[PDB]
Design an enzyme around this catalytic site. Structure first.
Site, mmCIF file in Angstrom:
data_model
loop_
_atom_site.group_PDB
_atom_site.id
_atom_site.type_symbol
_atom_site.label_atom_id
_atom_site.label_comp_id
_atom_site.label_asym_id
_atom_site.label_seq_id
_atom_site.Cartn_x
_atom_site.Cartn_y
_atom_site.Cartn_z
ATOM 1 C CB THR A 159 13.921 2.319 2.212
ATOM 2 O OG1 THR A 159 15.531 2.080 1.806
ATOM 3 C CG2 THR A 159 13.815 2.808 3.632
ATOM 4 C CG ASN A 685 -8.993 -10.466 -10.723
ATOM 5 O OD1 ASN A 685 -8.490 -11.177 -10.542
ATOM 6 N ND2 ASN A 685 -10.217 -10.277 -9.800
ATOM 7 C CG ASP A 687 -7.347 -10.843 -7.544
ATOM 8 O OD1 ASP A 687 -6.894 -12.012 -7.674
ATOM 9 O OD2 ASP A 687 -8.381 -10.877 -6.665
HETATM 10 C C1 LIG Z 1 -2.557 -10.111 1.265
HETATM 11 O O1 LIG Z 1 -3.165 -10.260 2.278
HETATM 12 C C2 LIG Z 1 -4.551 -9.298 2.240
HETATM 13 C C3 LIG Z 1 -5.012 -9.009 3.720
HETATM 14 O O2 LIG Z 1 -5.589 -9.888 3.801
HETATM 15 C C4 LIG Z 1 -5.120 -9.723 1.283
HETATM 16 O O3 LIG Z 1 -5.976 -8.455 0.781
HETATM 17 C C5 LIG Z 1 -7.321 -8.456 1.227
HETATM 18 O O4 LIG Z 1 -8.104 -9.041 0.235
HETATM 19 C C6 LIG Z 1 -9.399 -9.148 0.045
HETATM 20 C C7 LIG Z 1 -10.105 -9.574 -1.165
HETATM 21 O O5 LIG Z 1 -9.426 -9.078 -2.263
HETATM 22 C C8 LIG Z 1 -10.199 -7.696 0.473
HETATM 23 O O6 LIG Z 1 -11.509 -7.869 0.807
HETATM 24 C C9 LIG Z 1 -12.197 -6.810 0.273
HETATM 25 O O7 LIG Z 1 -12.541 -5.891 1.306
HETATM 26 C C10 LIG Z 1 -13.319 -4.719 0.881
HETATM 27 C C11 LIG Z 1 -13.388 -3.670 1.992
HETATM 28 O O8 LIG Z 1 -12.163 -3.020 1.616
HETATM 29 C C12 LIG Z 1 -11.744 -1.854 2.610
HETATM 30 O O9 LIG Z 1 -11.594 -2.476 4.106
HETATM 31 C C13 LIG Z 1 -10.195 -3.217 4.567
HETATM 32 C C14 LIG Z 1 -10.427 -3.644 5.735
HETATM 33 O O10 LIG Z 1 -10.202 -2.727 6.815
HETATM 34 C C15 LIG Z 1 -9.223 -2.446 4.302
HETATM 35 O O11 LIG Z 1 -7.912 -3.300 4.435
HETATM 36 C C16 LIG Z 1 -9.165 -2.110 2.724
HETATM 37 O O12 LIG Z 1 -7.816 -1.624 2.377
HETATM 38 C C17 LIG Z 1 -7.543 -1.574 0.916
HETATM 39 O O13 LIG Z 1 -8.041 -0.269 0.498
HETATM 40 C C18 LIG Z 1 -7.397 0.997 0.211
HETATM 41 C C19 LIG Z 1 -7.626 1.911 -0.684
HETATM 42 O O14 LIG Z 1 -8.876 2.097 -0.901
HETATM 43 C C20 LIG Z 1 -5.830 0.778 0.582
HETATM 44 O O15 LIG Z 1 -5.532 1.894 1.444
HETATM 45 C C21 LIG Z 1 -5.221 -0.650 1.461
HETATM 46 O O16 LIG Z 1 -3.717 -0.307 0.990
HETATM 47 C C22 LIG Z 1 -5.953 -1.540 0.587
HETATM 48 O O17 LIG Z 1 -5.746 -1.761 -0.714
HETATM 49 C C23 LIG Z 1 -5.508 -3.051 -1.392
HETATM 50 O O18 LIG Z 1 -6.709 -3.882 -1.428
HETATM 51 C C24 LIG Z 1 -7.935 -3.243 -2.245
HETATM 52 C C25 LIG Z 1 -9.288 -4.513 -2.253
HETATM 53 O O19 LIG Z 1 -9.739 -4.041 -1.036
HETATM 54 C C26 LIG Z 1 -7.308 -3.228 -3.837
HETATM 55 O O20 LIG Z 1 -8.027 -2.604 -4.909
HETATM 56 C C27 LIG Z 1 -6.008 -2.336 -3.606
HETATM 57 O O21 LIG Z 1 -5.195 -2.414 -5.106
HETATM 58 C C28 LIG Z 1 -4.823 -2.735 -2.902
HETATM 59 O O22 LIG Z 1 -4.470 -4.102 -3.188
HETATM 60 C C29 LIG Z 1 -10.118 -1.351 2.219
HETATM 61 O O23 LIG Z 1 -10.052 -0.107 2.796
HETATM 62 C C30 LIG Z 1 -14.638 -5.224 0.449
HETATM 63 O O24 LIG Z 1 -15.463 -3.990 -0.153
HETATM 64 C C31 LIG Z 1 -14.402 -6.179 -0.722
HETATM 65 O O25 LIG Z 1 -15.934 -6.758 -1.069
HETATM 66 C C32 LIG Z 1 -16.399 -6.620 -2.531
HETATM 67 O O26 LIG Z 1 -16.027 -8.034 -3.148
HETATM 68 C C33 LIG Z 1 -16.817 -8.958 -2.529
HETATM 69 C C34 LIG Z 1 -16.258 -10.383 -3.198
HETATM 70 O O27 LIG Z 1 -16.317 -11.282 -2.014
HETATM 71 C C35 LIG Z 1 -18.239 -8.771 -2.757
HETATM 72 O O28 LIG Z 1 -19.157 -9.572 -2.379
HETATM 73 C C36 LIG Z 1 -18.878 -7.347 -2.253
HETATM 74 O O29 LIG Z 1 -19.974 -7.092 -2.641
HETATM 75 C C37 LIG Z 1 -17.852 -6.374 -2.511
HETATM 76 O O30 LIG Z 1 -17.911 -6.113 -3.876
HETATM 77 C C38 LIG Z 1 -18.653 -4.865 -4.123
HETATM 78 O O31 LIG Z 1 -17.283 -3.967 -4.712
HETATM 79 C C39 LIG Z 1 -16.870 -4.221 -6.095
HETATM 80 C C40 LIG Z 1 -15.601 -3.078 -6.227
HETATM 81 O O32 LIG Z 1 -15.885 -1.866 -6.027
HETATM 82 C C41 LIG Z 1 -18.019 -4.315 -7.031
HETATM 83 O O33 LIG Z 1 -17.401 -4.360 -8.312
HETATM 84 C C42 LIG Z 1 -19.011 -4.959 -6.530
HETATM 85 O O34 LIG Z 1 -20.125 -5.087 -7.723
HETATM 86 C C43 LIG Z 1 -19.517 -4.626 -5.237
HETATM 87 O O35 LIG Z 1 -20.149 -3.327 -5.094
HETATM 88 C C44 LIG Z 1 -13.572 -7.532 -0.203
HETATM 89 O O36 LIG Z 1 -14.074 -7.960 0.667
HETATM 90 C C45 LIG Z 1 -9.238 -7.002 1.565
HETATM 91 O O37 LIG Z 1 -9.687 -5.654 1.478
HETATM 92 C C46 LIG Z 1 -7.579 -7.131 1.333
HETATM 93 N N1 LIG Z 1 -6.949 -6.211 2.311
HETATM 94 C C47 LIG Z 1 -5.689 -5.727 2.214
HETATM 95 C C48 LIG Z 1 -5.527 -4.827 3.297
HETATM 96 O O38 LIG Z 1 -5.415 -5.366 1.174
HETATM 97 C C49 LIG Z 1 -4.627 -10.036 -0.187
HETATM 98 O O39 LIG Z 1 -5.557 -10.813 -0.698
HETATM 99 C C50 LIG Z 1 -3.355 -11.011 0.343
HETATM 100 N N2 LIG Z 1 -2.700 -11.318 -1.105
HETATM 101 C C51 LIG Z 1 -2.670 -12.736 -1.475
HETATM 102 C C52 LIG Z 1 -1.833 -12.558 -2.613
HETATM 103 O O40 LIG Z 1 -3.086 -13.628 -0.916
HETATM 104 C C1 XV8 Z 2 16.395 8.948 3.748
HETATM 105 N N1 XV8 Z 2 15.328 7.814 4.647
HETATM 106 C C2 XV8 Z 2 15.066 7.978 5.842
HETATM 107 O O1 XV8 Z 2 16.023 8.616 6.599
HETATM 108 C C3 XV8 Z 2 14.228 7.018 6.395
HETATM 109 C C4 XV8 Z 2 13.616 6.015 5.714
HETATM 110 C C5 XV8 Z 2 12.648 5.141 6.288
HETATM 111 C C6 XV8 Z 2 12.255 5.417 7.751
HETATM 112 C C7 XV8 Z 2 11.174 4.611 8.470
HETATM 113 C C8 XV8 Z 2 11.264 3.968 9.604
HETATM 114 N N2 XV8 Z 2 9.889 3.229 9.453
HETATM 115 C C9 XV8 Z 2 9.501 2.422 10.683
HETATM 116 C C10 XV8 Z 2 10.008 1.114 11.047
HETATM 117 C C11 XV8 Z 2 11.056 0.720 11.897
HETATM 118 C C12 XV8 Z 2 11.667 -0.553 11.765
HETATM 119 C C13 XV8 Z 2 10.662 -1.594 11.390
HETATM 120 C C14 XV8 Z 2 9.524 -1.307 10.375
HETATM 121 C C15 XV8 Z 2 9.200 -0.050 10.211
HETATM 122 C C16 XV8 Z 2 9.581 3.083 8.478
HETATM 123 N N3 XV8 Z 2 8.343 2.292 8.187
HETATM 124 C C17 XV8 Z 2 7.864 2.293 6.974
HETATM 125 C C18 XV8 Z 2 8.554 3.470 5.728
HETATM 126 C C19 XV8 Z 2 9.751 3.981 6.334
HETATM 127 C C20 XV8 Z 2 10.206 3.979 7.396
HETATM 128 C C21 XV8 Z 2 12.948 6.569 8.517
HETATM 129 N N4 XV8 Z 2 12.618 6.547 9.839
HETATM 130 O O2 XV8 Z 2 13.143 6.228 10.788
HETATM 131 O O3 XV8 Z 2 11.553 7.419 10.017
HETATM 132 C C22 XV8 Z 2 13.841 7.400 8.173
HETATM 133 CA CA CA Z 3 16.754 0.831 2.685
HETATM 134 CA CA CA Z 4 -8.163 -13.301 -9.576
HETATM 135 ZN ZN ZN Z 5 19.220 3.147 -0.482
#
Ligand SMILES: *[C@@H]1O[C@H](CO)[C@@H](O[C@@H]2O[C@H](CO)[C@@H](O[C@@H]3O[C@H](CO[C@H]4O[C@H](CO)[C@@H](O)[C@H](O[C@H]5O[C@H](CO)[C@@H](O)[C@H](O)[C@@H]5O[C@H]5O[C@H](CO)[C@@H](O)[C@H](O)[C@@H]5O)[C@@H]4O)[C@@H](O)[C@H](O[C@H]4O[C@H](CO)[C@@H](O)[C@H](O)[C@@H]4O[C@H]4O[C@H](CO)[C@@H](O)[C@H](O)[C@@H]4O)[C@@H]3O)[C@H](O)[C@H]2NC(C)=O)[C@H](O)[C@H]1NC(C)=O
Ligand code: XV8
Ligand code: CA
Ligand code: CA
Ligand code: ZN
Ligand code: NA
Ligand code: NA
Length: 805
Positions: A159, A685, A687
């Site tokens: 879910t 890696n 990714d």
């Molecule tokens: C699916 O679609 C998505 C969205 O487009 C694709 O994901 C993007 O891919 C990009 C490349 O991998 C990546 O770009 C990087 O952004 C870095 C900044 O990141 C922050 O800001 C963004 C924007 O708001 C934000 O979305 C990020 O969110 C991630 O991180 C937090 C965790 O802290 C999470 O809450 C969130 O869920 C998300 O996590 C995911 O992505 C990260 C990577 O960012 C993963 O590690 C997680 O596992 C998870 O999957 C961030 O908050 C930026 O810093 C990067 O730049 C580095 O690399 C470049 C290379 O070009 C280099 O030039 C720079 O110098 C820099 O390197 C430095 O850092 C290195 C590591 O520490 C270090 O080794 C070096 O030496 C340097 O110091 C990079 O540009 C982008 O963030 C993500 N976005 C998301 C939302 O995931 C995805 O690729 C698609 N998938 C496919 C298969 O196509």
């Molecule tokens: C026992 N589990 C639950 O009762 C329960 C489980 C999941 C959700 C839930 C609702 N959205 C918002 C939403 C609605 C429509 C389309 C996309 C996103 C989510 N988005 C992310 C993760 C969980 C939820 C809720 N809820 O309604 O809060 C209740």
């Molecule tokens: Ca479900």
């Molecule tokens: Ca790769």
């Molecule tokens: Zn279920």
């Protein structure tokens, strides 16, 4: 602390959330234990139920009632949903003939058609047909609007990952909600369905639709509903919000239903008990549509009816126990059920070894119902590795089964009869999509597609620019009447060189040999023309792939195949060839068995060398264009060029050789010719994205020849199989794979048998979209077809699943 002594008066289901310790009146206050003292009294009225009756029509308004049947209720926006029917002689929405909605028919002051997402938990795709007799409102949505026969969820088919994917367009690895249960080792915190950690915003990445809307000036209803708020109240709250003044009214809303999932767990997907939950959800849809009709919004709102995942038959007796495999079961933590995730119980235990756990779990019992993987070896189509919340060891569980650590886990926890979470290509895990309203098409069926694509579409329906996500924007244009997104093809970043003959044989010192010194004016101009590209229109049917990053590469032409050869990776990025229905398979002749030939178009310095392979006792080589499919004995020489060679483990060569010698011809026979593009992938890696040169972890011993992590093939033919692949007038058909390049066949438990018994089963598990291969290679395919670009985007997202009907 919450100062619950504030009041909800005039605040019931307020949209802005108020900060502690002030008490809350929003739709999640119950879940946080934070509602004001009078929330139930004011906001959760139930008096007199949910339906008008004859005796209530024109009643004096009683503010205590759940909903109203007084004359003023329409202007107050709070009539029972059946008011017009009971009191004003109107028909229910479901009883009206459907009539195409050619334009939005919206009340004055509406800036855009609102979007209502009606999400149903556990609504398996086959319920649309199997339950159609007891779901008339849903059936009318489906038959009258736009529907798919099913929609593919993301893995794991749980879910929280799926609903958050729906909201963000992201794979779970990218948005961070990688299961319903998670441990994040950086935070050192656990995420659980029960409890307060899940409300911390640090778990939730990307940008969900309600945030995308708010940032761009479109107001959003809140998408979450506490479980104790009854469905009828959720609907009446949406309808009330839709009656707000223009400046205050949201444009996007979601309803969520815990059914049919809740009953499906207890009774199984088709338990006789399931009919009643399906009836009830239909009645809720009816309430919403009746309610929209009363507000004159029923030909104005876009409605999306969508599920998160399906439901399979699963009982306690179909449980595998790790205690039956592992000596050390107390040294591991397992996240159990329909998938397994394993990590060390203690980070202080240095005798913990993933390799020995994997080996103890591999092909140990003849009918074993799970398969272990290091996460980087999981099928690439799952996109389930690039997150520190995903444990290194993963168990893929067979449909209908569970995995658990010990028997005591299962009976100190048979209750249940249904579960979900399995591989997202499994038929029982598929779910539903229907779109109905002015922006959707009329009575239109579309092919199945993935739920990662809907965020873009929901952004299009609202005029929002989507945050960066994993959909391919434009690939669902065929669902829409208007608001289509018309993308342009990406620009090529690197242009190829077209080398001619530039090196004499003696400049090469590659340690290769070939018995080819076997000695005509007709035939000589002819071979020259093939090297200049004269057969290229036969073998490169959809244009050359565009290279979308900076690199140095060469286009190489041959009689039977064309390739783009990387001077940096010392091998092709892609090799393209067409095999007609009539093509014949031949052998590699005896005198050519170990033949490798220098390519006089490509310098010694940019070539592989045979001596590295001879010295690397682990590593052998294969060919991208297969010598078995040469068009003639003389053309076959081209197939042994060092520029067509790639490194391959011997265990891999068993797979690749069978694909090339048997399966390509079989597909050409079945599909009326095929065009094949094959190549290496480097994703060390894990990714899902092309590695740069400095990310490569392994080389052929002693050399700079990088070792691919995977090999792909894209196999294209005419959808109308009465036309040959090379003379196709209309839509294309495709299937692709990304095969892991592994030094053993431990994945295939039957690999000691003949390849005809296990290879194609391996390839089906590793089926891929062309788009997956694009991310992994930085190439862009199908650049020169006669087809619309949106049509080609849909083709690039297609996944051939090999699931039956
Ligand atoms: C699916 O679609 C998505 C969205 O487009 C694709 O994901 C993007 O891919 C990009 C490349 O991998 C990546 O770009 C990087 O952004 C870095 C900044 O990141 C922050 O800001 C963004 C924007 O708001 C934000 O979305 C990020 O969110 C991630 O991180 C937090 C965790 O802290 C999470 O809450 C969130 O869920 C998300 O996590 C995911 O992505 C990260 C990577 O960012 C993963 O590690 C997680 O596992 C998870 O999957 C961030 O908050 C930026 O810093 C990067 O730049 C580095 O690399 C470049 C290379 O070009 C280099 O030039 C720079 O110098 C820099 O390197 C430095 O850092 C290195 C590591 O520490 C270090 O080794 C070096 O030496 C340097 O110091 C990079 O540009 C982008 O963030 C993500 N976005 C998301 C939302 O995931 C995805 O690729 C698609 N998938 C496919 C298969 O196509
Ligand atoms: C026992 N589990 C639950 O009762 C329960 C489980 C999941 C959700 C839930 C609702 N959205 C918002 C939403 C609605 C429509 C389309 C996309 C996103 C989510 N988005 C992310 C993760 C969980 C939820 C809720 N809820 O309604 O809060 C209740
Ligand atoms: Ca479900
Ligand atoms: Ca790769
Ligand atoms: Zn279920
Ligand atoms: Na070798
Ligand atoms: Na094996």
């Amino acid at each position: 602390w919450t100062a619950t002594s504030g009041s909800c008066k005039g605040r019931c289901f307020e949209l802005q959330e108020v900060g502690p310790p002030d008490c809350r009146c929003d739709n999640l206050c119950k879940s946080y234990s934070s509602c004001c003292h009078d929330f139930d009294e004011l906001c959760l009225k139930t008096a007199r139920g949910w339906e008008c009756t004859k005796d209530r029509c024109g009643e004096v308004r009683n503010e205590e009632n759940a909903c109203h049947c007084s004359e003023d209720c329409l202007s107050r926006g709070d009539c029972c949903t059946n008011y017009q029917v009971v009191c004003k002689g109107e028909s229910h929405w479901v009883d009206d003939d459907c009539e195409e909605i050619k334009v939005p028919e919206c009340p004055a002051g509406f800036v855009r058609p609102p979007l209502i997402i009606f999400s149903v938990d556990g609504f398996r795709a086959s319920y649309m047909k199997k339950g159609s007799k007891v779901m008339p409102n849903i059936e009318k949505l489906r038959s009258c609007g736009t529907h798919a026969p099913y929609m593919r969820p993301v893995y794991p088919t749980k879910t929280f990952p799926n609903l958050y994917t729906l909201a963000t367009g992201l794979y779970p690895e990218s948005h961070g909600i990688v299961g319903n249960s998670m441990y994040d080792p950086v935070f050192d915190a656990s995420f659980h369905l029960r409890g307060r950690e899940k409300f911390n915003h640090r778990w939730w990445g990307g940008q969900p639709l309600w945030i995308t809307a708010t940032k761009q000036g479109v107001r959003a209803g809140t998408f979450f509903w506490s479980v104790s708020i009854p469905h009828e109240r959720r609907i009446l709250t949406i309808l009330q919000w839709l009656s707000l003044p223009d400046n205050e009214r949201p444009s996007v809303y979601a309803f969520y239903s815990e059914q049919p999932d809740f009953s499906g767990h207890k009774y199984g997907p088709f338990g006789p008990e399931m009919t009643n939950p399906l009836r009830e959800i239909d009645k809720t849809v009816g309430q919403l549509m009746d309610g929209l009709k009363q507000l004159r919004l029923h030909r104005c709102v876009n409605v999306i009816f969508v599920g998160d995942h399906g439901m399979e038959d699963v009982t306690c007796d179909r449980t595998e126990f790790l205690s039956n495999y592992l000596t050390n079961v107390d040294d591991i933590t397992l996240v159990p059920g329909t998938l397994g995730r394993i990590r060390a119980k203690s980070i202080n235990n240095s005798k913990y070894d993933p390799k020995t756990i994997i080996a103890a779990l591999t092909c140990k019992k003849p009918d074993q119902h799970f398969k272990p993987y290091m996460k980087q070896h999981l099928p690439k189509r799952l996109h389930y590795a690039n997150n520190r919340r995903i444990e290194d060891i993963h168990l893929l569980v067979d449909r209908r089964w569970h995995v658990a650590r010990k028997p005591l886990d299962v009976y100190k926890k048979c209750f249940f009869q249904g579960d979900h979470g399995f591989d997202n290509k499994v038929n029982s895990m598929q779910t539903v999509f229907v779109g109905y309203g002015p922006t959707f098409k009329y009575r239109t069926k579309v092919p199945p597609f993935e739920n990662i694509e809907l965020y873009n579409v929901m952004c299009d329906l609202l005029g929002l620019k989507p945050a960066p996500n994993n959909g391919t924007h434009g690939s669902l244009n065929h669902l829409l009447r208007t608001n289509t997104f018309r993308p342009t093809m990406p620009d090529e970043v690197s242009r190829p060189n077209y080398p001619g003959i530039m090196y004499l044989q003696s400049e090469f010192d590659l340690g290769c040999t070939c018995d080819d010194k076997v000695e005509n004016k007709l035939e000589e101009l002819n071979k020259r023309l093939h090297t200049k590209g004269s057969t290229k229109e036969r073998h490169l049917l959809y244009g050359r792939p565009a290279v979308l990053y900076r690199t140095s590469y060469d286009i190489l032409y041959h009689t039977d195949f064309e390739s783009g050869y990387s001077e940096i990776f010392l091998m092709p990025l892609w090799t393209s060839y067409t095999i007609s229905k009539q093509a014949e398979v031949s052998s590699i002749p005896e005198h050519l068995t170990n033949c490798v030939r220098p390519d006089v178009r490509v310098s010694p310095g940019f070539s592989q060398n045979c001596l590295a392979y001879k010295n690397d006792k682990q590593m052998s080589y294969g060919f991208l264009f297969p010598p078995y499919l040469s068009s003639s004995p003389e053309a076959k020489y081209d197939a042994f060029l060092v520029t067509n060679m790639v490194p391959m483990y011997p265990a891999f060569k068993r797979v690749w050789a069978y694909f090339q010698r048997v399966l390509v011809k079989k597909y050409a026979s079945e599909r009326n010719g095929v065009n094949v593009i094959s190549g290496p992938i480097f994703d060390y890696n894990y990714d899902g994205l092309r590695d740069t040169e400095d990310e490569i972890k392994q080389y052929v011993e002693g050399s700079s020849i990088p070792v691919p992590t995977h090999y792909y093939s894209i196999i294209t033919s005419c959808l109308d199989f009465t036309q040959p692949a090379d003379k196709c007038d209309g839509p294309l058909s495709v299937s692709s794979f990304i095969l892991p390049h592994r030094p053993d066949n431990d994945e295939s438990c039957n690999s000691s048998e003949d390849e005809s018994k296990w290879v194609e089963e391996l390839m089906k598990m590793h089926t891929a979209r062309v788009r997956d291969i694009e991310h992994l290679t930085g190439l862009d395919f199908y650049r020169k077809t006669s087809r619309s670009y949106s049509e080609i985007l849909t083709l690039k997202t297609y996944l051939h699943t090999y699931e039956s009907e």
